[PDB]
Symmetry: C3
Subunit: 627 residues, 3 copies
């Protein structure tokens, strides 16, 4: 018969004038439909965005379907007898180009991610015909890209492609990775080749043939870096050999976007197989009506015998004209023995520069980190998270100094704003390279008042207040410089050899409780002027050997009524209430002059205000004022 | 008549053979002119870069003008009778493509910036017809882009577009954002539609019609982050509703390049309206001579009655042929009720990586900062600044550790080189992420001699010298390690609990003036070997309670000629010039052996060189050498 | 006769039907060859990537050859008397597109680099005819770019262009920078012009002529920054003047990718001349057979006399058909007085974001750096280095704080992982913007157990162990806070004015050897309660002036059997074995009460367990336990 056009609002309504289509493996098809109708005003809104189908009759009475969605439709002017319409038919994945999103996918395989993207927007017409197993991705971001671009690039990276299967009421995206996903349509497992010389030929056949070969790179070598295994040899290479000349030129790329050698080997295989796919393509013009992109057929009857083989259709163009029926298609084919892989055509997203994010973690915690000192962050574009420990992957944090179990360390805490950079601009590879203050997380010292201070201030955890901190600060204000050292709890200074302290002016030391000072050998102390001691309790000096007391002028020992005075000239004055002098052996009292007993020569010697307990305690307590 | 060609050097000189033109809203037009002249050598240099005009006669005797600048012109070979020339006509903004510049615009609206760019290069033929008010930009950079791309990109972002109005002597760029900026040419407020079937038609009319609808996204959602308002909800959404299917797919983007919710809402409106603009496009072919891109007309007489409406011409193509006159235009139109907005076609500039810049500020200061610890910088590509406080906007500085009123802080000072990064690569979003030393701002410690040292060194401000600094340094040289702590002014160490000091070898303490040491409770000091004290002035020990002095071998108190000696065996030796022993009560002198008075038993006991004031002071001053 | 084709396996085999060619200066040719053969199965593999030659004979019997390689070959189907084949002919440089690699070139000129790339993949057919001298480059990256793109970008950046000269057996890439590598083909130094009006002409001539003039920028201004000369004025400008209007609009760009003004002057000059190159294009259609791009010809016999000049072929288009020969070329030309420079067309490599690297150095050292504190780092994409001091160029390291001979400093050491960022995305401008820990170079404190600690830990060099380090750490754990200060060797603290120490609870000081403490003026020590002293050796106090000892309750001096006791009430008790009291002058013993001699009033006074050498030493040694 002809080809029939069925759509919502009526099957009888639209008559196909001409159709021109393009199909390609792992790509959206396009069907340009020129149509007529007796109705000069079919409402475009009523068929736009809705499905439309083409029914082409095959040998045997069965029909081939061209099903898709009307992405665009037009009313073109005409004279009285017929009215002109045009429609473009695209597959349902094209509707994913109408929607864009920033989203993070975690701990899923690419097929799992793709299916989720499909099912979320309520799409169901698809099939998994994948044979290989696909790695689970730790972190995979859809960033600033339409959902279609997102799934497409993922398929391109993992070596997944699709073809469409058209039924009367639905068309189905088939996910594929091997020869076993493709089939031959009934009555078209083997088509023949007949030269155009005959005039008319009865059966569906091919009438033109071409084969073309291009020089392609012979190998792809990939490389990457896993910080958890810095010494690992992650270099991988995949080779494809051709018999012709100049078939040995090598490709190299970094990074290969993998962490496990097995994954990289596959990725390298995919990319080179995809490049190699276009080394030998056969083009066949024909009236073959059953064969479409994704279909397997065999060629028979061509002069060059080796060419009579099984082909995989990678691309097809179509032309159908009707007078009110002739069908012709040009096919792009490769040997079915060859392995098809998609070229990286859909653009990969790239974060042009660094952005800021918020350090996140579990409900309870203040700090959330791991063995490598990483943190989890929440991005500003993420709308589908809970700002918890599940917001992102573990991200590495740059430091001031990093070495082998030594260096600097300041772990980003929950709630703080960090600067996140992206390795090679890859949104799937974040790394933290900065810390910034904002309106809530404010600067330590009041600015611009304290522009001259410099420093590090900490914060106790968990449950600290602005009073609980460990710091070091350097004041630069000229003539008011100062270095401050705060230990909220205990402070421990430890010097393995010689410690020096040089203070230009005064030193003021105050211990609230007990001080213990031990010297392992000799201790020497020199005071250029006055030395003073005040003890509010009891003093005890204990020397194992010899104790010496020297004075240039005078030595006094005063205690209440007891007064003892030794002078430089040799005068010795001892006063008290009563005195007792005893010796077990002999006692000698000698004078070069007279020795007087109760003559009146010796009287009470002045205490000069010293030795009074009340006064001394007053002087001591004066050093320790109450708050 | 026909169409006439007027240019510098003569109106009679050039005759239009054929013309083909392109016009589009908010885009530069292009007019391809094939022309002949009797003169076989019009000098190309004489008409190139100067304006050229086309005068097409309208009904009513009035004329339509096609005015522009000759961007390129050619002398083509010809036959004897006439010589052929061709020129391409573009509007004057095209000359902005001849010039490129890096420049910073501060505190102006986009229209203001557009006008400034225009007036600077001496262009005046333009018109402001904007109805809405446009936000003032704090910071807006023209970076590595032609002036045209710069102005075009801003218009596209703010929903501004332009059309041209052609006079005999000038053509004028009209800035537009609404229906009110467009007009209808005289005699063309209403054009009729006549089918081409009729044969020949007298009046200017349309003879072909098409309307087309395409599926477009139904919403755009934008988002951004303002550090001055970290908690703010800046997410915005803009909807356009269509009656057809699949019209509700949503778009999302970040950042929206805004800080105020209201402005972002506008930005979301502009971008979605631009997307929606291409949902319903009408194409009209005609012999209509008055209608041009930017013009409003009405259609009359078309079969589909609703289509007889007011249209805005978004794009026009032209074909004019003359024999030695026929005029044809194809029009791209939208409903005038719809709001036209430009698509983001002109590329936005992006700083691919980080650059370095110099911190600037007012003449007097050494440090210039604000409440958020920001600094102002001078870029190396900026030629139109003064390297002062007006060079740039306030830029945030990354730190080692940043939290809520705690963390690290080191403010970049004026004159220093910093590393500036750009958020999402946006030149309008700078952020400082690094500090680098250079040939002038040199490293603190001499390298590579002191590669082993580590540290932070400060600088007093203002008016500091290399002598004025607070630092901490760590020497790593093996066997020569050292930690240095410098306080140029005062040093304050504060420990809330227990302080420990452990020194493996010697400790050397030196105070230039007074030391005061207070212990809140008990003080215990132990010396494993020898204890020595030297006092150059007067010593005073004051105990409130009991003072004990014990020694294993001997206790000596010597002071000049007075000598007192207590021995372990029990010998007690007192020497002096004179001695006075007095008691108010009773005095007892007892000996288990004999008591001898002036027998000769007691003699002067040796001072052993001690107690001489000159010697003592000498020992003290030895500890405090000059200068 | 005609055009003959010689290729591998037989020249008689391939007979050229038609061909179309495209040639252009500084770009590889494309030659489309349709062909017939009596053999309907020439195998493509025998010819593909092999060289192919086309011989068109000149006047005089001499021959023109088009030489090149077959990039692609197709067998088209046929009918009986012939068979159809097609070949594409490209030059050998094109095979560089089949090979890509990351690489770093060190201290070479661009020509030297290019020749290396040629010689390495073993190409020999090339020639240098450069007149100008080309600077050596410090560092030059080939990154994520095939070899062809790499060489061509460098050529475009240095204004080198190339052309082809074909021999029967070889084709040769000739590199040039001026009018002097150009030559004229034999018999074609001056061709003639004959108008088509004359009819048909036998001898090689031109029959169509056109000129083209466009509006181009009149100047290019470049700028850059050299940190080794921060004050340097590196702005450079290059002008080209034209007589027509609007010819003075200026271009500006940054960075100019230079450090020396002379280099930038040239680089600005090359890029302006290339823009300028396309301002006056002459196009001549022709039947002349010797003329090819790169070739200098002259023109005779054109009406416009000035146009009879010397021209440089910038491009040629080519068409030959043959029935079994008629030859036409269109040429694009520029005056020879002008100087061609290619367009910056092959895209530049661009590192979207930051990388990770390992610092390298000489075999012996631990740290390798320079006067500016720079380090040499080794990339992960590099495969041709030795991870030594030659891997990379000198790279600058960001710091926490950088000023004029002050600030922070922590030099990256060998082996450590750093973050490499790239100035304006340029792979030949890397700098360090981060330090990161990994699985080998691990965090200083064990995480996440010690997430609460904060700090800087050092490492002695050379030959340090985990025991050898200088650190500062801040414990934030609530209720267990601590600040730790480690000096592996000596510690030196220096305060120019007042030093303060405030300890809330206990202070514990321990010196392993000698402590020396000197006070420049007054020293005051106050103990609110009990004071204790323990000396294991000998104690010596020496006061220059007056020593006073006061007590509220009692003063005791005990030493073995000698016991001295002074009480508050005034009782004075002296006991011992024997006592000797001597005076040079008079001695007075007086009592207000009775004076008793051997009455029995005075007895031995209790030592109370004090003064025993063994006991005292026991107390002292208790303070100094053995390990």
């Amino acid at each position: 018969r002809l080809v029939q056009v069925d759509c919502p609002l009526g099957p009888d309504v639209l008559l196909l004038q001409r159709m021109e289509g393009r199909e390609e493996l792992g790509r959206l098809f396009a069907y340009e439909l020129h149509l007529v109708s007796e109705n000069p005003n079919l409402p475009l809104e009523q068929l736009l965005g809705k499905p439309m189908s083409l029914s082409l009759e095959l040998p045997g009475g069965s029909r081939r379907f061209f099903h898709g969605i009307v992405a665009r439709c037009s009313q073109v002017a005409g004279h009285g007898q017929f009215a002109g319409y045009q429609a473009t038919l695209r597959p349902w994945p094209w509707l994913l180009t109408r929607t864009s999103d920033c989203r993070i996918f975690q701990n899923q395989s690419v097929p799992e991610i793709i299916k989720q993207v499909f099912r979320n927007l309520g799409f169901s017409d698809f099939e998994d015909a994948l044979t290989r197993p696909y790695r689970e991705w730790e972190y995979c971001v859809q960033y600033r890209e339409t959902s279609f671009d997102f799934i497409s690039r993922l398929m391109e990276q993992e070596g997944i492609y699709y073809w469409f299967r058209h039924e009367q009421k639905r068309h189905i995206l088939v996910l594929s990775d091997a020869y076993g996903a493709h089939r031959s349509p009934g009555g078209y497992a083997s088509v023949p080749y007949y030269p155009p010389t005959l005039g008319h030929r009865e059966r569906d056949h091919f009438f033109d043939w071409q084969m073309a070969r291009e020089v392609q790179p012979g190998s792809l070598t990939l490389n990457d870096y896993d910080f958890q295994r810095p010494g690992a040899r992650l270099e991988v290479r995949s080779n494809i050999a051709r018999p012709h000349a100049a078939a040995d030129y090598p490709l190299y790329d970094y990074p290969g976007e993998y962490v496990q050698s097995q994954d990289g080997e596959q990725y390298a295989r995919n990319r080179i197989e995809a490049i190699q796919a276009q080394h030998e393509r056969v083009r066949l013009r024909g009236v073959v009506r059953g064969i479409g992109a994704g279909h397997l057929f065999r060629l028979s009857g061509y002069p060059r015998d080796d060419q009579n083989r099984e082909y995989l259709v990678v691309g097809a163009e179509y032309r159908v004209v009707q007078e009110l029926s002739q069908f012709e298609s040009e096919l792009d084919c490769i040997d079915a023995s060859q392995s098809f892989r998609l070229l990286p055509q859909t653009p990969v997203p790239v974060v042009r520069g660094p952005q800021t994010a918020v350090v996140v973690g579990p409900k309870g915690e203040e700090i959330w980190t791991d063995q490598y000192g990483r943190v989890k962050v929440h991005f500003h574009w993420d709308r589908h998270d809970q700002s918890n420990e599940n917001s992102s992957c573990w991200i590495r944090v740059s430091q001031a100094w990093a070495g082998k179990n030594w260096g600097s360390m300041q772990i980003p805490r929950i709630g703080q704003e960090v600067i996140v950079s992206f390795l090679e601009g890859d949104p799937d590879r974040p790394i933290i390279t900065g810390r910034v203050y904002n309106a809530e997380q404010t600067v330590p010292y009041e600015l611009p008042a304290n522009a001259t201070q410099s420093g590090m201030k900490s914060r106790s955890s968990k449950g600290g207040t602005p009073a609980n901190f460990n710091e070091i600060r350097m004041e630069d204000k000229k003539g008011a410089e100062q270095l401050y050292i705060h230990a909220e709890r205990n402070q421990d200074n430890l010097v393995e050899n010689d410690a020096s302290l040089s203070v230009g002016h005064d030193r003021n030391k105050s211990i609230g409780h007990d001080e213990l000072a031990r010297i392992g050998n000799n201790r020497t102390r020199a005071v250029k002027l006055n030395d003073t001691l005040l003890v509010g309790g009891a003093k005890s000096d204990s020397v194992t050997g010899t104790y010496l007391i020297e004075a240039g002028a005078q030595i006094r020992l005063v205690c209440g009524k007891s007064v003892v005075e030794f002078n430089a000239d040799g005068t010795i004055n001892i006063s008290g209430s009563a005195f007792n002098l005893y010796a077990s052996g002999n006692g000698n009292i000698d004078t070069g002059g007279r020795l007087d007993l109760n003559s009146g020569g010796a009287s009470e010697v002045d205490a000069k205000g010293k030795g009074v307990q009340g006064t001394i305690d007053g002087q001591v307590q004066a050093m320790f004022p109450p708050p």
